[PDB]
Write a protein that binds this ligand. Sequence first.
Ligand SMILES: Nc1nc2c(ncn2[C@@H]2O[C@H](COP(=O)(O)CP(=O)(O)OP(=O)(O)O)[C@@H](O)[C@H]2O)c(=O)[nH]1
Ligand SMILES: Nc1nc2c(ncn2[C@@H]2O[C@H](COP(=O)(O)CP(=O)(O)OP(=O)(O)O)[C@@H](O)[C@H]2O)c(=O)[nH]1
Ligand SMILES: Nc1nc2c(ncn2[C@@H]2O[C@H](COP(=O)(O)OP(=O)(O)OP(=O)(O)O)[C@@H](O)[C@H]2O)c(=O)[nH]1
Ligand SMILES: Nc1nc2c(ncn2[C@@H]2O[C@H](COP(=O)(O)OP(=O)(O)OP(=O)(O)O)[C@@H](O)[C@H]2O)c(=O)[nH]1
Ligand SMILES: [Mg+2]
Ligand SMILES: [Mg+2]
Ligand SMILES: [Mg+2]
Ligand SMILES: [Mg+2]
Lengths: 31, 31, 430, 430, 427, 427
Amino acid sequence: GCTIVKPFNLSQTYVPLAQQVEDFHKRTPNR
Amino acid sequence: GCTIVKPFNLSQTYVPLAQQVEDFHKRTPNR
Amino acid sequence: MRECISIHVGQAGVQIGNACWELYCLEHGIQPDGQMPDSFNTFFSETGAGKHVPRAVFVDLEPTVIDEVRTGTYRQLFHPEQLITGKEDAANNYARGHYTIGKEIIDLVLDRIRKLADQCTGLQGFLVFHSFGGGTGSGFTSLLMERLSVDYGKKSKLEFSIYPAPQVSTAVVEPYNSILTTHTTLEHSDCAFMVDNEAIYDICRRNLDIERPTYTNLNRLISQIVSSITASLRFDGALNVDLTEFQTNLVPYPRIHFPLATYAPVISAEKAYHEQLSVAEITNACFEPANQMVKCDPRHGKYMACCLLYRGDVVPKDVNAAIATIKTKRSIQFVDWCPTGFKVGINYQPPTVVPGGDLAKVQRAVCMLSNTTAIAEAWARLDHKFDLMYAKRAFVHWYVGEGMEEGEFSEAREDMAALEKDYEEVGVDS
Amino acid sequence: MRECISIHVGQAGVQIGNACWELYCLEHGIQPDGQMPDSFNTFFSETGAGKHVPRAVFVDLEPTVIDEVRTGTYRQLFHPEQLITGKEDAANNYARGHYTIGKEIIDLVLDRIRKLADQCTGLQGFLVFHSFGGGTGSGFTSLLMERLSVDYGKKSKLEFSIYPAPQVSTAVVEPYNSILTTHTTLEHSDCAFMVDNEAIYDICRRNLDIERPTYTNLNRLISQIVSSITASLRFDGALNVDLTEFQTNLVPYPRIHFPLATYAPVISAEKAYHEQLSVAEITNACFEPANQMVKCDPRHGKYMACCLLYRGDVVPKDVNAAIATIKTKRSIQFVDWCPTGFKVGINYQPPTVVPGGDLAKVQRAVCMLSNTTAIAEAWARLDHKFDLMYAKRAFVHWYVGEGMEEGEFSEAREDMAALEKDYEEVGVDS
Amino acid sequence: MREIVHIQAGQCGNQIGAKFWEVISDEHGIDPTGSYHGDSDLQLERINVYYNEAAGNKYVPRAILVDLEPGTMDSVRSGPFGQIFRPDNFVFGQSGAGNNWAKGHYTEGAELVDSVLDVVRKESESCDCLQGFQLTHSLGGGTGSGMGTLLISKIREEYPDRIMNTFSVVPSPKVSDTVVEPYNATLSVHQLVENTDETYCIDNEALYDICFRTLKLTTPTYGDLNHLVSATMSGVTTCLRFPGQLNADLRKLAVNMVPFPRLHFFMPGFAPLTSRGSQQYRALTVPELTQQMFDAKNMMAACDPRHGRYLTVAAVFRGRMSMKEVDEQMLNVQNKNSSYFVEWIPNNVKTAVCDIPPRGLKMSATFIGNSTAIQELFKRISEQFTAMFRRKAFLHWYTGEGMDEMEFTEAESNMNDLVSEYQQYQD
Amino acid sequence: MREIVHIQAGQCGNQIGAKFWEVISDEHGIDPTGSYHGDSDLQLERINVYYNEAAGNKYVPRAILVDLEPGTMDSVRSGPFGQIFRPDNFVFGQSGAGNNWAKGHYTEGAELVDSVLDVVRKESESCDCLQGFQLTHSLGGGTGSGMGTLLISKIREEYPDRIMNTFSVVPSPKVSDTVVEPYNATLSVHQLVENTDETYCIDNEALYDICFRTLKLTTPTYGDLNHLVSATMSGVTTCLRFPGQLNADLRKLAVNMVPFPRLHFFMPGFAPLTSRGSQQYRALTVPELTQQMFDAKNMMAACDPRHGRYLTVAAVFRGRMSMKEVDEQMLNVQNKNSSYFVEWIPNNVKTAVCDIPPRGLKMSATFIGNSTAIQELFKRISEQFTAMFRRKAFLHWYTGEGMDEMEFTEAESNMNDLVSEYQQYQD
Ligand SMILES: Nc1nc2c(ncn2[C@@H]2O[C@H](COP(=O)(O)CP(=O)(O)OP(=O)(O)O)[C@@H](O)[C@H]2O)c(=O)[nH]1
Ligand SMILES: Nc1nc2c(ncn2[C@@H]2O[C@H](COP(=O)(O)CP(=O)(O)OP(=O)(O)O)[C@@H](O)[C@H]2O)c(=O)[nH]1
Ligand SMILES: Nc1nc2c(ncn2[C@@H]2O[C@H](COP(=O)(O)OP(=O)(O)OP(=O)(O)O)[C@@H](O)[C@H]2O)c(=O)[nH]1
Ligand SMILES: Nc1nc2c(ncn2[C@@H]2O[C@H](COP(=O)(O)OP(=O)(O)OP(=O)(O)O)[C@@H](O)[C@H]2O)c(=O)[nH]1
Ligand SMILES: [Mg+2]
Ligand SMILES: [Mg+2]
Ligand SMILES: [Mg+2]
Ligand SMILES: [Mg+2]
């Protein structure tokens, strides 16, 4: 009918400056 | 009427890779 | 965009890196002075007019290896500030690398990295080259990786490591360093390609007909693997694999990120003429134990995922055929929880060959990256080696002297035990 | 497709093989460097552009004979990896061949064979060349044959063997080796063509007018027979015989797979001009004891089946006539359980002749492969020879030293006794 | 007057899309610059179905090109016909989706999609009477599958009364190029079930078989495969683009072929198909075309029609043909092959005829079959999904994009239900 | 309108088949390209009996070429007329059968045969009213014999109401080229007895005799032999292909020649036959043709008709001839040779006349005799089989292909029964 999962037991921000600059221009405003 | 047999008493898988490849193409499916 | 930043740590890292940069230059037509008489931008920044600079940082705690680079053929390729050198090495001591000596240089290197990264507009991530056995390659790299993980966070980090051999070991304390670095490698690395010098030597002797292969021979081969990995970013073909893509395909569970790399065909100029090196053939050769970059037996392990990265005169159909053939080979077993374990990349550019290199020029090549349980055997032998020495506390005092605590060793060993156990578990069928 | 793989084992096997490969090259117009300025594919793989490589593996436990090939005229014809050589020979000791020395090289040769076979898409089977008397030719071949039988199973194996002479024997221990190899030959070989050096020598002196025939003379002749067998695959004519076909026709019972080969006409340039070598004549000459490749008397035996393989300017009608004539000759008797004992092949290509060879160029030739009870006489003499030496246990200690057991000898002798008895039985009329 | 809006999502979608556009421009006499250089007035009569008319005797595809990677866009623009497309209709990300349906559907794709929506709204406004949408993509990757599905949902929300058509290339296990395909397909199939009105199941495996076996093509490329798909696509909308004797558009086809809402997954076929050598030994006639079309070897989905029953078939004929002949041949096929047709839908075959044949041929045929055998395709996929999902293999990546296990469970259930439904009507 | 479907199996079958096709194309004015370049409207009137009409004024043989070896196919394709055949009608294996009936009937042939069946079904569909099948082969090998027989069985199962004709070249002991011939012949003969409606017994020995003795041909080739066979084949179906004064097709011939179901093994003959030197010293007349035809030396089976009795003879005449003359000559032969004709079938001779003579001749004749002397042929074969089977010689090979001894016993019994039956009616 449906799948049943039994999982085995295992052992358990910056942005670039150039990119930022680019975003300043090519980011579309909400408008 | 019919033959009768009396037999004298005597002392008593791999496939090539290229071939396989070929089969993969030129084998016709069941369809 | 799509830049990758390369970090070369310690002697081994530096020397591999040299080879890599030689290869990249040849591939993009960049001369040793940075001039080029586009895709090269993935590896190079471009400045002003007729100048290209590698997106790379070279670090060692001693000056000797880097000093060669400064004096040598590619002195104009790198700007001086990207070649970072201390005064005293880590002396095969993880503690010195991570703490005593490393704490003096780490900030500086991080700053430079940040500067480099600011120049790149589509950072894919980092390629980190280092040995597991050396004090710098272990201790410093571990430290560096932590810091990078903190600062950058979700950026992909890929580390290429010269893992120590079973027999052919050059230093005594190697198992200690290896164990200690592994602990940190687990949490801060997204994918780790282990490589074994002994295996490379065997390959050079058997496949390339070289009586006496030296480190220069190994490094060249190693660079080729890296090129195959990054060719999908530096060129374009019929089927493409990005780094994130690769990670998605090749890594089934977070900790199980240790694929084995293998390259095909590795042949001599004269030996190659006679051979009819077809797609099927090279693919088949990938899954053979003799061509492996780590000493271990795949026949005794199970495959979880393989990425096949083809380059040159290759079409999808024949790759598919090869994959089908591989499927029908009983001696190559895949785990039952992976009904298809093949990610496939195909790139149009044939492998370019370094003038004076050991490898012959071929129309097609392949780099297979496969996650097999068999690699756990290496860890087992290393662990065993560690356990003997630790039984007597041999050399331990040195580490303690440089600020390391005994409890750390035990912790590290435990971590590796747990990892081996995890690897065992994934193996078993239901 | 329709490939045949040739395996050349030990000195004798190597030397016959050299001749064979010289002949094949000449037949297909392949130069000694692999270049050819189609059917040749049955014997050659083709690589890239202007290169053809023999579908062959050359094996010896000592380097000397193969080393000649490496240095010599056809060094470029074979790729180095197809020429396999150990360090120490089997020293006329079956045990050393099969066990002590052979176990070191067998795996490697098998691997290479597998690689070779993977390249072929319509494998017909194997041609195995070796002596019965040498330690490598016996012990190694026996081992190899077993392994091949295991791996490949239902593939046809054809072995061409230099069986030891009654008088002209070069080594002392020959009968031991011969007996031991025969045991294994029985179970793992589908068809075996025995050949006797003494007979060849007689032929060379009597038919070719050669005062002093050497091994090079024998080998050339031997190669011709092989060519006749495989011409049906390498060319096409009016009537064709495949290997399976041949087996079906020539082999009445599983163990009775020992046909005698004979070739006609074998003549000198000057002697041939005068003779009017018709189809009928050559056919008649086939069934004469003086032109046999094994020393023995067919007049004292009975024919069970003969394959006649004609080549060159030949038409069916005259072959039929010849067969009819043969039927009416009282001195050539066929068993009563075979009302027609003739399989006939006719191929359009005349035999090509090696420059500087002993044989004259003819418009037509024939190779007869006939299963006659008369060959049992050879076995009888060999058995007798064996029995004397074994009576004193002469040389036995050597074999034991290399891991052989005395019981094996007895077993082998018994097997041969049983075989001789079987051969006797088939002979008798009802 | 009945404009169709075309959308291409992800690499496969883009590439097939490009092929489609190339063929269609040729058909309508449009060159690589957008200028009409055809012969017949029929080529321009209904040009507005696929093209917007720009200033100075030029035509521009009503096409939107979408991808999370710009490489694909570059490849398209650099192609033969690349310059015909509106520059503002290329909507691309920079990152890619890494074969992750979640990235395409919830994350990167989510960020991207509003631009696409804006474009398509404008494209809708431009058209006087938009009959609906055609989306080309694959179900096995991340962009085409996740982003594509998302886009479909958005579109349907805004245009609930318009016809929603997809040409979906499904992952097969023979030609299995990726690891997570089962997941991506499963997730996307579910979404398709609720939001598309007709879905053409295109299979790479079947295409390869066609190329190798029927076309005798030693080395097929993706381009060659794509060509087949393009032909099929062209076939469906021939009735919208040209005159004819009996005409059926996208709606008429759907109404005749879909008896229950969910059962809208077609196995397409195209006829004729011949090798270059075997072209001279054939008959250019309707019985031959018919023969070709109903054959299992000419279906573009890897399913044996003899393993199920046909609910409906729609056949679209192009060229000058006798209606009587067509009617006889279609009745013959249903009478002779009675056992492969469901018995509770009399006259299982719908016919449409367009007088204008494709270039190079005097007659051609396009076949759309709704067969219960399509369940085979879904079943395999389901099995593969199960194999992975049972061990939660690769799930962590998807969960990192905000997905929960429960969604997987739902999708799987849904697909199973669909399969069951098909079986029910098969009987 | 009365299409015949031609099948060629194994080397001999193929080669004779090729010859047959060559002659027939010449007869019907078809060149090596498939184009009609004849003079008379009669040449095209019934062209559909043997040829399918392709696009652009071309004709293609309704011929299927079958072999377990591709070499034969290659040889055919490379021959003069090789290019006329449909490429899709070549159905070939790669291995060969190695003169083993079991490989042809149960193993390799089994694997092969479904393709062949598919082809022939299509070929049947193409024809408006297929009257039946003609198979050319030999009984002594593996393919033609084992595979051929298998194919026949399959065909008859699907077309039980169609006429099933074979041109079977039998192994003779004089011209004995193989060892296991007796086995292969025995096994195949049995199968033929139950599943063919008429079988033309062609013997290589007889052909050689004809060539040497009658045609004065110093060096006959298989080609020359084949020519004779081809002529005979052409003769039988002349009434289907042309007009005439009295017409008999394949069915009419069978009904008149076969009084009991099993007795359908013909000894064929063809007249006239002359040397090049001896051609000028002869009379082109019906009495001469008649004289030639009934002679033992002109029969294509190595049997003396004077060692048995004729059950029936069918004579097929081609050319402009007097019916009266034909009737007188046929009555004369039966009155004069009373003792060689069974007395309980009055007027043992059936006559058919076609107005169109073959090329090069003004008149020709084809003779089909059902003689009880054919038992001689079977008896020899039986004897040879016994000689081998008594010692179980070469049986192991056959058993390796799945065959049992019991089958051999059965076949032998069956053949013996057939022989007995012929003897019975001989009296
Ligand atoms: N028939 C065709 N199949 C294709 C083509 N290109 C790719 N594919 C197939 O589709 C699958 C790969 O899909 P894609 O490259 O489209 C995945 P997409 O780019 O849409 O999203 P990403 O996950 O962001 O890459 C796989 O089965 C390929 O073998 C094509 O041009 N034709
Ligand atoms: N009258 C003719 N007889 C032939 C011809 N070719 C072969 N033969 C005869 O037929 C017998 C050999 O038969 P085949 O080559 O046809 C056996 P086939 O290829 O059908 O099966 P295999 O056993 O797989 O070879 C033998 O008596 C030949 O002498 C031919 O062109 N004409
Ligand atoms: N493949 C390869 N391995 C190398 C090379 N140089 C050193 N190694 C290996 O690296 C390990 C030694 O570590 P190094 O990198 O020399 O040491 P380090 O990182 O400089 O650390 P310290 O000198 O202790 O500060 C050993 O396993 C060496 O075999 C090289 O050029 N190529
Ligand atoms: N016809 C022929 N016979 C040969 C040739 N060389 C050796 N012999 C015969 O082969 C037998 C000796 O066996 P070899 O092949 O020399 O020995 P081997 O196989 O190398 O075995 P070991 O040297 O004992 O390892 C003798 O009967 C020789 O007469 C040759 O070139 N032609
Ligand atoms: Mg150092
Ligand atoms: Mg030796
Ligand atoms: Mg993509
Ligand atoms: Mg044959």
